[model samples]
Target: AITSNEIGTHDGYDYEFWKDSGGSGSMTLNSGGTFSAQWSNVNNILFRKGKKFDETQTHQQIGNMSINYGATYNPNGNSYLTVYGWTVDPLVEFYIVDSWGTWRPPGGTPKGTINVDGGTYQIYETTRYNQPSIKGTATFQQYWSVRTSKRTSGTISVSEHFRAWESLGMNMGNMYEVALTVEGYQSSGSANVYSNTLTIGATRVEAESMTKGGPYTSNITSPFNGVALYANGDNVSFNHSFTKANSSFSLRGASNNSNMARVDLRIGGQNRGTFYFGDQYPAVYTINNINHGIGNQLVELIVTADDGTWDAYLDYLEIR
Candidate 1:
């Protein structure tokens, strides 16, 4: 009999089996009558003719602490557990299922127990995004009714952090999906109802960060006779000319050798106001106040030299 104090009623079967010879031969039977079976040295079989049995022995004591007898955090694994964003933990032998039903384990497989002490209880389930399936986001489900469990007060919670392998852009031209579930019991006589569902395209987006392309590049060609760009840490530079009507073009350098010094824009050696080139990107040069008609804007960064020579690269152009 199942006993607590290990005395009379509870210790029913304690002395039932006699320790006979090596092979259980010297066995004796304690029949309810005054007569008992003789010890059989060779057979080693102590068969009791008849005996009353007690299922559970009663006791009067304290300190048998019933745990907050539920799971700490909902136990979880990869793949099948956190489908979409939910989690499930199986309630096995330790749990009570009064009727017929099953409990889903960590693996996708299910184990059905014949007898169980199971009933519904209000609980919570959470999901975190960390596994390959879902990482980075977390979700929760409340008002949960769980499946088989010995503890009628059984409660469960899970987490799901749904993440992706790629970046989610503002213009989501692609479809995203996720699945999740929680460990729970449907009822005493039902199969373990795995709360699994797929989350399709939703308006809400997961947060993320991105990078910017550095040092922009492009081809420069035009009637404006100039091209402007920023580079070399804010320095400005430009090699430009006038191409609009009623205007003049020039090449100005330090020397007379077209590349060195040449004040090429003037009326027959007449003095035109000095328009010095300015540096913005730490010595990069640019054109300052160049006078031009409304319809004939002054050329910028572009030179009309037929050889395509005398081209300039501007680091930056900031006006005061």
Candidate 2:
């Protein structure tokens, strides 16, 4: 729900004014981070920042996610950065790579093409009829991304296009809610969107260590040539095994300008905490519901590097 900023109607992802309509102006949710919308003659208005699921879930159980946005617009029509989900009924999906001006999508025809991040998208399938909860004639299967140009910003690895639409068989059902939107239909004049990050489960299992899970000092140095190296009490381990049921974990890294380092995070061996790395940018450290009673679990990182280039860069490891 919205934290503070005033608007007429609002409700969580469960629907009912799940962001009903926008006509005049004003739509914000700034306290929980950011969500701002302005409208004028808006039609299919829904300036959303959503996520909900407890019923339908698949496509790797809603894994591998990302949605990074940044926008500034003055659209007289069309302005989007979307993702909508559904999969129980006769199938319902949504994806709109990105957009900015002119806004076009009413009688699409193409319908086929995929390959993101490396470009080459051209899929336009249409079918619509007042769908928000679907009660009568649910038939809205949209997949528009006929982009040759048009993007307000980047990053959209939403399950790699659901694995390229499940490699053509296209059955991305079971997922109930996945949103990051800014849609205006009847045409508008204002627009401002910013969601620097919104990641979901899986994807980012990196930490392909090159060795050395212990010992360091003597002016430090152990295989430091690229991926990153140099330590004080060096140790960087990883060993995971679990087919399902994850509790949550994270630890990406960076450091090489303001130096700074401090580490200590072990799992199966205990001591599950302690992190401090001078942010010269890249950073992510999380660990929730540490119930490591699954299959195997042993992740370590024990460095204290007290400045000898301080050094710290592990760059990978994530679980859900």
Candidate 3:
């Protein structure tokens, strides 16, 4: 069904469409995380859909989408084809513009810039004062990382932008959703997203790519696959649930403090103490011998700080 506005679940993901009164547009969510939308003569309109995460999770979100058919676009108006979403508490609307028509979206000086996936994005922040938001007419902030090199299809390292925003003193609230959006304001255009995927966890089994529970909104650039998670503060840790048991474990770790950086391990109803490595920077840490059985067993690494809290970098971790 095609309509100006509609919201529902489709193809196992949440989908949404909104257009101002009398705006001309239509949207249809197809199968397998695919969708299409068009707009003409509208004050504002948007079509979006994607995965929502638990507020307790801070996964290293990354994904890829393929944008097809935007040749019918009317640059006479304004539009944006991007990954769009909102967060609550701090209440932020964010856009990672991959394509656009006519006017460049979000005018004004960028708050900062960060490089990812061979591209540089100009970060910008704005205030949507008392306009309609997730909590109904309320004041909130909007964040943007407009791509200087716009392309319709590619991988987006969404968490990188999240970290960038916090580094610039702009904090984000809990996530509402991270989606692929086609939007138009005072203009007309159309877009078709043939496919999309938003993976909150690592596509690979890497520490920084997994769930960084407790105060990991920050990161440090590293030689290990581009970046590493700089673990800091009390009770900070990494967590994963595996269905199979592995007898060996290995990790790349570094201690920023004396007395060797350590992590307490908990798995299969057992706790192992005294390093499980990294008495020094870039040291190889391991717990190569163990027995475990599993069906959603917790693989936890709780950083142990000798003094106040643990401070270090986790390059990566593995099991065998």
Candidate 4:
């Protein structure tokens, strides 16, 4: 493996390293989004591998980021492994810490907690007055979503953390960068990222979040299993932006119609297919191998048919 210690782009990824007076370490960026790092006898060190957005954009404008990573990270003293980055305008730094060792960091009362991508993260907010930041040394708030149980690998919903922070009254500005990060503070350790994928993805758009009209209403009480269920419609449409041209899409819903309830899936300005859900509870359904374009497009369900009071209930739309 080639040792890459400089700040630059490699294999379409940007990397940077920083250390205080006596801090020391080096990292290698392997092909296919893998990397390794070793650090010892350091006061503080920061490393990164992610994107840098134009200052004019927000996280929403940046689309959703999903991280799928696998690694073996060992920290000898006070250290951290996180999805770390920052935003300008507000000059806020953020950390979605997945793993750590020795002195578990930022120990204090947690602001709150949020569940995302199979784990619970304790929220925290701290201010660093006249400290280092993307916009240089200046006062800024540091937002943290520290997982209670440390993990070296799993899926992460980066956008979910941004939203969770907003709900807790900690707002971020335009994103600067979000990266798979490893940091050491007066510590020693080595981390090997066996596999890593940071992808911009869309969340399943729930029916309740979709636009409703002509009998497809969102607030039908539960006998319907999904809270997103929109019942009885001629056409139910929602706007979704596929970050990339994903070839598969799915919809989950159920009906109690004597006639097997069905829905005609329409998108990309063409009818794709018709799916029938069984005449009870919700059925899991999806359409595969579709030829579609990227970017924002409207997805519509035509002639949602069912037997009970509401002919069809749309739970959610998942495009991948």
| Candidate number achieving the greatest TM-score relative to the actual structure | 4
lDDT of 2: 0.59
RMSD of each: 31.4, 16.7, 13.5, 10.2
lDDT (C-alpha, whole model) for all candidates: 0.21, 0.59, 0.67, 0.76
Q: Which candidate is the best by lDDT?
A: 4
Which ten contiguous residues of candidate 3 have the minimum total lDDT? 63-72
Q: What is the C-alpha lDDT profile of model 2 across 1-320, one tens digit per residue? A: 33222324223322212334545555665423246667777666655665656545675876777776666756787655555555555456576556656854534566577767535666665656676643345666655555556666656777777677667655556766666666666777665665435577774554443245545412222232113445656766667776664467777665655766666677778876666667556687777766656677776776754567666666666777
Writing each residue's lDDT as its tens digit, candidate 1 over 1-320 gives 21111112111222222222332111221222111222212222221111222222111111111111111122121111112111222100111111111433222222222211123322222232332211232332211222434331221221101111111111111112111211222211111222211111101100000111124323222212123222322112222233432433332212111331111122222333332232212132223443453342222222222132222332223221
Better of 3 and 4 by lDDT: 4
Ranking by lDDT: 4, 3, 2, 1
Model 4 agreement with the true structure over 1-320: per-residue lDDT tens digits: 33334577778777777677675688877876678888878888876677767788899987879888888898899888899988988899899999898866677789899887657999999999999766778999999999988888877789999999999899899888888888889898899977778897435766655566665445444544233223445566777776766568787876645446777788766888876777667777888887667888878876644445546666677777
**Where does candidate 3 clash, by residue pair?**
none
Task: Give per-model TM-scores.
Answer: 0.15, 0.32, 0.59, 0.64
**Which clashing pairs does model 4 show?**
257-307
Cα RMSD of predicted structure 1: 31.4
RMSD of 4: 10.2
